[PDB]
Amino acid sequence: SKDGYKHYMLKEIYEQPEAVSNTILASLADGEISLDSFDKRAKELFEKTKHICIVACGTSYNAGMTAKYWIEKYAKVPCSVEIASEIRYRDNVVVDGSLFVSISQSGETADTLESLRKSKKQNYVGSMCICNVPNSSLVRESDIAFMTKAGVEIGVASTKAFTTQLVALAIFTLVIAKLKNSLTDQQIAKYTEELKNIRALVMGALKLDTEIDQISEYFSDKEHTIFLGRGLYYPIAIEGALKLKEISYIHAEAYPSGELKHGPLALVDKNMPIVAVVPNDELLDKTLSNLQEVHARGGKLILFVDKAVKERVNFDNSIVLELDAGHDFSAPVVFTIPLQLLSYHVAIIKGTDVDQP
Amino acid sequence: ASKDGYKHYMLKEIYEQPEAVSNTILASLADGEISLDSAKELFEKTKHICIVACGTSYNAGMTAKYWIEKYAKVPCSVEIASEIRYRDNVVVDGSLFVSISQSGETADTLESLRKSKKQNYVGSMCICNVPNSSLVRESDIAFMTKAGVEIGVASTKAFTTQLVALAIFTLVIAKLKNSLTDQQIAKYTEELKNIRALVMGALKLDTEIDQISEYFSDKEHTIFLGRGLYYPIAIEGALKLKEISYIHAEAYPSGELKHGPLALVDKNMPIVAVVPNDELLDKTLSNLQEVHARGGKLILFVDKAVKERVNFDNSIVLELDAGHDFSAPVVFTIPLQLLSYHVAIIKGTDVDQP
Numbered sequence: 149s150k151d152g153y154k155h156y157m158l159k160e161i162y163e164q165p166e167a168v169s170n171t172i173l174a175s176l177a178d179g180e181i182s183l184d185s186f187d188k189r190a191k192e193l194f195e196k197t198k199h200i201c202i203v204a205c206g207t208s209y210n211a212g213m214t215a216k217y218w219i220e221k222y223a224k225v226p227c228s229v230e231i232a233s234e235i236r237y238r239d240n241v242v243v244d245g246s247l248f249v250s251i252s253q254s255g256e257t258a259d260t261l262e263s264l265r266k267s268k269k270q271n272y273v274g275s276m277c278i279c280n281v282p283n284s285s286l287v288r289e290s291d292i293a294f295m296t297k298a299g300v301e302i303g304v305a306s307t308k309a310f311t312t313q314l315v316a317l318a319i320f321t322l323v324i325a326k327l328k329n330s331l332t333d334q335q336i337a338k339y340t341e342e343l344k345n346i347r348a349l350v351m352g353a354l355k356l357d358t359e360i361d362q363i364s365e366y367f368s369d370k371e372h373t374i375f376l377g378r379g380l381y382y383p384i385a386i387e388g389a390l391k392l393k394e395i396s397y398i399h400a401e402a403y404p405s406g407e408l409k410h411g412p413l414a415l416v417d418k419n420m421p422i423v424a425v426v427p428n429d430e431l432l433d434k435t436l437s438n439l440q441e442v443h444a445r446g447g448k449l450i451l452f453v454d455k456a457v458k459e460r461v462n463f464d465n466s467i468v469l470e471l472d473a474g475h476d477f478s479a480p481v482v483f484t485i486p487l488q489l490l491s492y493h494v495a496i497i498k499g500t501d502v503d504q505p
Numbered sequence: 506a507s508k509d510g511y512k513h514y515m516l517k518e519i520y521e522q523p524e525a526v527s528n529t530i531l532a533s534l535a536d537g538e539i540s541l542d543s544a545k546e547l548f549e550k551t552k553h554i555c556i557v558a559c560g561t562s563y564n565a566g567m568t569a570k571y572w573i574e575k576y577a578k579v580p581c582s583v584e585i586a587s588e589i590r591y592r593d594n595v596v597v598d599g600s601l602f603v604s605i606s607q608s609g610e611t612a613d614t615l616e617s618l619r620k621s622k623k624q625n626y627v628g629s630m631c632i633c634n635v636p637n638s639s640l641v642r643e644s645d646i647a648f649m650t651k652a653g654v655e656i657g658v659a660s661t662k663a664f665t666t667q668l669v670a671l672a673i674f675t676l677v678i679a680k681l682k683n684s685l686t687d688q689q690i691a692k693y694t695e696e697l698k699n700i701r702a703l704v705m706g707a708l709k710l711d712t713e714i715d716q717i718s719e720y721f722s723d724k725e726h727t728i729f730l731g732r733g734l735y736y737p738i739a740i741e742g743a744l745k746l747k748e749i750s751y752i753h754a755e756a757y758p759s760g761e762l763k764h765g766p767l768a769l770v771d772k773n774m775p776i777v778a779v780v781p782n783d784e785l786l787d788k789t790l791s792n793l794q795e796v797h798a799r800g801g802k803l804i805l806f807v808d809k810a811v812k813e814r815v816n817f818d819n820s821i822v823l824e825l826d827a828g829h830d831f832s833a834p835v836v837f838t839i840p841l842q843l844l845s846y847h848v849a850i851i852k853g854t855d856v857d858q859p
């Protein structure tokens with residue numbers, strides 16, 4: 149069933165508030181993030197963890213990249229993130245006390261699954277899967293499984309699997325943080341409340357649907373797009389580009405906003421759409437400065453901006469949609485939504501398939 | 506200011522690469538051998554290596570990572586300087602901060618080094634080309650490339666010499682940590698020395714590549730493919746083509762077409778791929794097959810020892826002897842540099858800085 153939506157992909161984008169909130173709920177006990185909701189081996193395994201090794205592919209790899217910022221900053225555990233089809237065949241070294249974390253919607257992704265199998269002959273303390281399908285090879289073969297509650301996906305692009313993977317990784321960050329005393333019980337509580345507030349913010353984000361539909365006409369004759377973000381939002385930009393590419397077949401590519409200097413300024417002219425995410429954080433002034441460079445070349449700026457910075461965002465002839473995105477934990481998820489909607493509508497404009505067979 | 510008889514500074518710089526490579530090795534040899542007298546204190550304390558850089562130097566770092574983990578067996582991470590600079594990061598115990606930069610003045614990289622002094626690194630090392638640069642001055646050890654001066658728009662000899670310095674570093678650290686036998690150090694040392702002739706063999710393709718570049722005249726996209734070591738080499742290729750021809754060139758790890766990158770392939774789409782003589786040939790060949798079935802125009806730079814297994818109707822194949830893990834990454838970069846130069850000339854774009 150599409151539940152009245154025009155396409156399954158659009159239904160799934162609209163299930164995200166429920167999905168996000170179901171994922172959080174499953175790890176709570178009395179509204180607090182609880183270690184008791186995890187498998188009971190989990191704690192011993194986390195006490196031994198000194199390094200976290202995230203392996204995944206595609207959208208799940210983009211989630212992992214986002215999570216590394218959170219893990220290092222809040223849990224203070226070093227984190228590396230690697231593409232499964234590369235680590236699988238590479239002759240790598242495993243830090244002592246390394247936890248192997250895989251991320252997968254289906255739990256059957258070949259390269260990820262085979263990276264897990266290889267890891268069992270290496271120096272890891274153990275494995276954890278962030279997965280959506282219980283009773284999948286990845287869940288069975290890992291020591292512990294944190295389950296997302298995304299339900300099933302028929303959209304060509306994954307939507308709710310990505311946001312729920314982000315939320316699971318945020319919850320994991322706080323569990324680790326607490327166990328290793330990286331955060332006070334009061335910080336844990338403040339960031340837990342921020343995760344709970346995601347549902348309302350995601351729903352707000354979904355309000356931009358109609359305006360994003362109107363904007364998407366701009367893309368009908370376009371064969372390139374550039375996505376921009378910094379920090380946590382770089383991987384969010386990469387995920388946005390992946391959706392656009394995957395279902396509209398536009399050559400969409402993401403760049404960390406600080407790196408335009410060398411490569412991508414060259415590509416920007418007056419026919420080039422630039423989609424950027426401009427959050428309420430420490431790096432606003434850098435980002436506005438990077439955006440200026442791009443504006444200077446005639447790029448068509450399409451900006452999704454947190455309401456708290458919109459007054460500071462002024463570019464002649466840009467398009468600016470504003471929203472409340474919250475802080476470090478919520479904003480990466482919230483800003484994803486517009487990008488999913490963008491890719492949905494541009495796909496319709498191009499007449500490409502949004503749903504799978 | 507001399508073009509040395511070449512038509513452009515960039516062409517000249519491409520052709521200085523044999524000299525620059527060999528000069529970079531020389532400055533780190535002692536009687537043709539990797540010795541430490543040519544600091545040993547830090548490397549002893551180093552348990553993890555953190556490479557920080559941007560653009561081309563970052564792509565050199567990404568290649569070196571494969572080497573360092575495989576041969577030196579030291580865990581290594583590479584990060585883009587403008588991100589690590591502002592990120593709340595955690596430093597593993599025993600981490601060596603390694604920066605890479607031609608000028609030694611790159612703001613993001615320089616500030617990352619300054620930030621690192623307040624963190625838990627055992628010390629720093631530069632891989633730099635300008636002695637008396639902030640990065641040289643402020644690092645504990647410097648490993649000098651001998652790239653001379655660049656005036657081309659795209660960096661050519663900065664990149665190859667950075668790779669060679671990083672290979673040398675790998676072997677130094679490997680010896681000191683006893684990760685390889687003296688006989689393996691000797692053999693890989695010979696491999697680096699052999700680069701000069703292999704790079705000269707590659708420069709002979711200049712004319713053929715000129716004929717090929719004809720294909721790119723009306724193209725606005727290109728995809729670059731590589732696996733393992735050769736993925737960052739593909740990224741470097743893409744960076745050059747984009748930077749000087751303004752084509753929308755993008756590199757992908759050949760294992761990850763199985764997402765969107767396959768959707769972008771049609772029959773008017775050049776696919777530039779590096780095909781080395783390594784264990785991954787079978788999977789690279791499968792990857793190329795799928796790209797081929799969707800109408801991609803394959804353009805393949807291929808090691809001679811595997812050219813017999815490369816058979817695609819309507820593809821363009823240039824073969825060369827590229828050697829093994831240390832030399833081939835540097836050898837395969839040469840044709841991609843040459844490609845971007847010629848394509849730029851075909852697009853009427855500029856190859857040289859004013």
